[PDB]
Design a protein around this ligand. Structure first.
Ligand SMILES: Cc1cc2nc3c(=O)[nH]c(=O)nc-3n(C[C@H](O)[C@H](O)[C@H](O)COP(=O)(O)OP(=O)(O)OC[C@H]3O[C@@H](n4cnc5c(N)ncnc54)[C@H](O)[C@@H]3O)c2cc1C
Ligand code: HEM
Length: 579
């Protein structure tokens, strides 16, 4: 039993969601109050992502003798933080299934989050040498933009992209980029379109001239980035398609759904002459080879020492995890996989929890409970919620995303084209890249273009320019993914890689040796969007949603309306203190 070596349809895989949807879609209830209580714990945690694991860890720090049960519906622990493995050339190649890197941790990680990192042996400075920052730039590789036939008349890859991005691992002086005029000059757009794009960068003007600074901020909060480019900068409908998908990977929405103020904060072009006040700079290098799955693995090994030997950040990378040790009776911490919580109820100074596993209901009991699952799931579980609080929890509509890992036999085609990363403005996969090169522990990142390498590509099922709000794009994105077979997902992967790399000799039937699709149908937590949400009413809803209910506290990154691992930790810490 070893989920990380499984390929194919992963993420929220078949088997993980069916009981959840029986509750969510069919409104079936699974009451367990006529079943005998089978086990008792000090703490029961619903949900085995980073938030739930942190809740267990901080609970145990406060109560060293505590008996803790973690209930998790997927076949692996970690929630969005998942380890993916490939076997190639007799060596393991690691990928991350979801939760990707520690985001600007020097600036954003709270005291408690840094305390967890220290106790687990994670030294942030180690990544200043573990991350091979100059590997790809030193090979002369650059980022590129792929324009597709269907939207631009021709397939064309344009390299040398100088576009600075929010979470950038490449030092600016090492982008191997070209001037805006040279770069944009190769775009397969009309001469007029190209000269307006170049002017955007070479001749910024105050597109909101006359307005005060406060009026500009108000306008930009209620205007989408796409409408600002269209109505105020004056770009054509064809020119703005270049910007449609740029924000998909980081925000799970396109330029039609992001306020122009948020594009400004993320360094998008078009604001340089508006006279706006100061708001991206921390190097994006805090990346284990399996992403933030290493954080989950570090906590699990620390909470359940029998699952794996070693201590510290180095030996976790290749540590062998024995999943049969996760849920042993008598062990004070038990992690119960493949299990959907269906009921949570305060009773007699404690909490009764029902869960379903392999089609059968079970009842356990805790002194305390932390609900670290998707917040939208809580109203279907927590029988004590007021109607007001249940409605608030349901307002956190999460964003769907797909992280796909592809094993290439070699990456000579990437070398030939001079690229390590591609942006595709109007294709399903908007970001395709050679994986981050990290050496940590005994793991060595692939180096030889003649030999296998992992590729990472992000697909966000947006519905741009439709007049939808963000919650509706998210829901509709999930219906689209629900309609797609694995075979359909694989055809998109293969078709796009063939069209982008094919001119340099790539043959997808021969050069792809592995595919892992991490389908995160419920991905990023919702976040307050000033195009569609009132800030004061959103703050109130968020605060109400996560209010403690007896001895049941609410966590997950969802509870912060903030899709980050440090939010997951901070929300768990708040949940544990409330108990
Ligand atoms: C594709 C992707 C990439 C990301 N990249 C980054 C990144 O680079 N940096 C960063 O800081 N953050 C990133 N994130 C944010 C990510 O959500 C957090 O980092 C963190 O992994 C979330 O932890 P969590 O415990 O709050 O939620 P989750 O990881 O989602 O854990 C909640 C768990 O509870 C389970 N659950 C739900 N209902 C039930 C039930 N009834 N019974 C039992 N279990 C249940 C869910 O299935 C899930 O496994 C990314 C997210 C996604 C989707
Ligand atoms: C294959 C993976 C999945 C797909 C394709 C999928 C798809 C969908 C769709 C289309 C909806 C309706 C739109 C919405 O309300 O957001 C939905 C809702 C829901 N999903 Fe999923 N989902 C998946 C996985 C999961 C998982 C892992 C869970 C929880 C363990 C889950 C729990 C729910 C719940 C509770 C709802 C109802 C939300 C509400 O009523 O507020 N789903 N899902």
């Amino acid at each position: 039993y070893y989920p990380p070596a499984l390929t194919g349809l992963r993420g929220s895989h078949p088997g993980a969601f069916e009981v959840a949807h029986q509750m969510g879609w069919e409104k079936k209830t699974f009451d367990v109050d006529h079943l005998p209580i089978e086990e008792e714990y000090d703490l029961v945690v619903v949900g085995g992502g980073i938030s739930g694991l942190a809740a267990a860890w901080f609970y145990r720090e406060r109560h060293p003798a505590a008996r803790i049960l973690v209930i998790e519906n997927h076949d692996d622990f970690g929630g969005h933080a998942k380890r993916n493995e490939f076997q190639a050339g007799g060596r393991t190649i690691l990928g991350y299934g979801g939760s990707e890197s520690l985001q600007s941790p020097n600036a954003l990680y709270s005291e408690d989050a840094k305390h967890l990192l220290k106790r687990l042996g994670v030294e942030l400075k180690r990544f200043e040498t573990a991350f091979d920052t100059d590997f790809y730039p030193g090979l002369g590789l650059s980022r590129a933009v792929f324009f597709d036939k269907a939207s631009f008349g021709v397939d064309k890859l344009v390299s040398g992209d100088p576009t600075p991005m929010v979470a950038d691992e490449v030092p600016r002086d090492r982008l191997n980029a070209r001037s805006w005029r040279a770069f944009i000059g190769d775009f397969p757009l009309s001469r007029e379109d190209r000269e307006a794009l170049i002017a955007l960068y070479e001749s910024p003007r105050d597109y909101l001239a006359g307005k005060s600074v406060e009026e500009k901020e108000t306008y930009l909060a209620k205007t989408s980035y796409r409408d600002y480019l269209l109505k105020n900068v004056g770009l054509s409908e064809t020119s703005v398609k270049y910007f449609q998908g740029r924000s998909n990977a980081f925000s799970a929405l396109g330029a039609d759904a992001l306020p122009a103020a948020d594009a400004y904060a993320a360094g998008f072009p078009g604001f340089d002459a508006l006279g706006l006040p100061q708001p991206m700079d921390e190097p994006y290098i805090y990346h284990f080879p399996d992403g933030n799955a290493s954080l989950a693995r570090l906590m699990v090994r620390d909470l359940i020492p029998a699952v794996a030997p070693g201590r510290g950040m180095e030996d976790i990378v290749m540590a062998r995890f024995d999943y049969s040790k996760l849920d042993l009776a008598g062990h004070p911490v038990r992690l119960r996989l493949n299990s959907t919580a269906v009921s949570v109820r305060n009773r007699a100074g404690g909490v009764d929890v029902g869960y379903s596993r392999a089609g059968r209901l079970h009842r356990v009991r805790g002194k305390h409970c932390v609900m670290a699952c998707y917040n939208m799931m809580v109203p279907y579980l927590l029988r004590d919620l007021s109607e007001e609080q249940a409605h608030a929890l349901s307002q956190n509509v999460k964003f769907p995303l797909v992280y796909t890992k592809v094993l290439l036999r070699n990456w000579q085609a990437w070398k030939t084209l001079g690229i390590h990363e591609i942006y595709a403005p109007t294709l399903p996969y908007s970001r395709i890249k050679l994986d981050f090169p990290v050496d940590l522990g005994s793991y060595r990142h692939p180096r030889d273009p003649r030999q296998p390498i992992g590729v990472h590509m992000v697909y966000v099922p947006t519905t741009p320019n439709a007049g939808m709000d963000a919650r509706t794009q998210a829901r509709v994105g999930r219906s689209k993914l629900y309609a797609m077979s694995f075979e359909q997902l694989e055809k998109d992967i293969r078709d796009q890689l063939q069209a982008m790399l094919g001119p340099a000799g790539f043959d997808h039937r021969r050069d792809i040796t592995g595919i892992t699709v991490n389908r995160w149908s419920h991905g990023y937590s919702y976040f307050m969007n000033t195009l569609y949400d009132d800030e004061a009413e959103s703050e109130a809803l968020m605060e109400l949603a996560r209010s403690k209910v007896g001895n049941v506290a609410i966590a997950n990154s969802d509870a912060a309306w903030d899709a980050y691992a440090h939010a997951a930790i901070d929300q768990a810490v708040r949940a544990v203190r409330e108990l």
